[PDB]
């Protein structure tokens, strides 16, 4: 059952996690009606968010001579920072990176 | 022992922590140098030069071991390994053993 698109395939991942603006009503009327309230004052909200993830990792005992393949950035000189904002502010990420540098026997 | 052997074969190294520990075993040949004599020798001997190439010493029939080159310790991969993840490094223990 490891997801099609990858990644870890679990019966209890993580679990959602819900919000929302308790409606404020406006002025009711002052005299009774029965319908709900469809007027309401206009709100909005914010605030901060953490999230701590610890994750084991397996080393490599690799007993293989020559050295590996690595990702790596590329000296040679550009306008930008590969991962990094450009003058305008925008942070971008110029290319996918996978998992599979390192090697192992079958 | 004649028929008993003097040592093993050790060639690995192991990553402990904050620590690397490198190990290397090969196979050495010696002759006889100089046939077992002391010889004085210098420039002269070895059929003059202009001065800045003179000089004056001795060969000996003794040889000697030196394992002063890093590749005598890492394998590529090793050094892979430490160049892409250390900012540093010095050595601290040695161990010397001649067997066989």
């Given at each position: 059952?490891?997801?099609?698109?990858?990644?870890?395939?679990?019966?209890?991942?993580?679990?959602?996690?819900?919000i929302?603006?308790?409606?404020?009503?406006?002025?009711?009327?002052?005299?009774?009606?029965?319908?709900?309230?469809?007027?309401?004052?206009?709100?909005?909200?914010?605030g901060?968010?953490?999230?701590?993830?610890?994750?084991?990792?397996?080393?490599?005992?690799?007993?293989?001579?020559?050295?590996?393949?690595?990702?790596?950035?590329?000296?040679?000189?550009?306008?930008?920072?590969?991962?990094?904002?450009?003058?305008?502010?925008?942070?971008?990420?110029?290319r996918?990176?996978?998992?599979?540098?390192?090697?192992?026997?079958? | 022992?004649?028929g008993?052997?003097?040592?093993?074969?050790?060639?690995?190294?192991?990553?402990?922590?904050?620590?690397?520990?490198?190990?290397?075993?090969?196979?050495?040949?010696?002759?006889?140098?100089?046939?077992?004599?002391?010889?004085?020798?210098?420039?002269?001997?070895?059929?003059?030069?202009?001065?800045?190439?003179?000089?004056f010493?001795y060969?000996?029939?003794?040889?000697?071991?030196?394992?002063?080159?890093?590749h005598?310790?890492?394998?590529?991969?090793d050094?892979?390994?430490?160049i892409?993840?250390?900012?540093?490094?010095?050595?601290?223990?040695?161990?010397?053993?001649?067997?066989?």
């Amino acid at each position: 059952p490891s997801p099609l698109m990858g990644g870890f395939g679990m019966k209890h991942p993580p679990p959602q996690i819900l919000i929302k603006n308790t409606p404020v009503p406006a002025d009711p009327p002052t005299a009774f009606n029965k319908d709900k309230l469809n007027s309401f004052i206009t709100q909005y909200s914010t605030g901060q968010v953490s999230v701590e993830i610890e994750w084991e990792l397996q080393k490599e005992n690799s007993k293989r001579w020559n050295p590996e393949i690595q990702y790596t950035s590329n000296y040679y000189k550009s306008n930008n920072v590969e991962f990094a904002v450009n003058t305008e502010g925008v942070y971008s990420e110029p290319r996918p990176i996978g998992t599979r540098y390192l090697t192992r026997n079958l | 022992g004649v028929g008993s052997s003097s040592g093993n074969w050790h060639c690995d190294s192991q990553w402990l922590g904050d620590r690397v520990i490198t190990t290397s075993t090969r196979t050495w040949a010696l002759p006889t140098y100089n046939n077992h004599l002391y010889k004085q020798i210098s420039n002269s001997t070895s059929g003059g030069s202009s001065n800045d190439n003179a000089y004056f010493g001795y060969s000996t029939p003794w040889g000697y071991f030196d394992f002063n080159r890093f590749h005598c310790h890492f394998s590529p991969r090793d050094w892979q390994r430490l160049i892409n993840n250390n900012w540093g490094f010095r050595p601290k223990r040695l161990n010397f053993k001649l067997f066989n």
